[PDB]
Nucleic acid binder design. Structure first.
Ligand SMILES: [Ca+2]
Ligand SMILES: [Ca+2]
Length: 76
DNA sequence: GCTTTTTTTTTTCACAATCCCGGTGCCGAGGCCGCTCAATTGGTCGTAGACAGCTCTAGCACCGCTTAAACGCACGTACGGATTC
């Protein structure tokens, strides 16, 4: 298997559609070829929690925990 | 060679200590139970250190002289240790 910032790239990159990108449609695609452990959902929200704050991923619209994201940082 | 007497050896009577039975009694080892908190699973992230490669410190070897030091022996003193008190 590959890492979870390896997995988060594959869903949003391949197709590009529902709610810009959001939490359910990412986890549906991700499970098909990561091969699911129980920790999948726990370390997929953690991967998002540190990727949104670093600059690799930037968020479109939300409040606190919920929302929707993109890949290209804002103004870049 | 005898006596006497002093020392040492031998036995012969004692007594705490031990052990094996029995029997009894109590409390803490040893196990159970219902948690929870600390080890485990999994993945992410950053650097500690094996490893290769270079430098060049300093550790080893070698020699031949000078003489301080070690070695060995002659000699007798004051020490160690036995004995006695
Ligand atoms: Ca479960
Ligand atoms: Ca280093």
């Amino acid at each position: 298997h590959p890492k979870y910032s390896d997995m988060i790239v594959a869903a949003i990159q391949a197709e590009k559609n529902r709610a810009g990108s959001s939490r359910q449609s990412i986890q549906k695609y991700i499970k098909s070829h990561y091969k699911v452990g129980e920790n999948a959902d726990s370390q997929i929200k953690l991967s998002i929690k540190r990727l949104v704050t670093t600059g690799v991923l930037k968020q479109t619209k939300g409040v606190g925990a919920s929302g929707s994201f993109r890949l290209a940082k804002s103004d870049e």
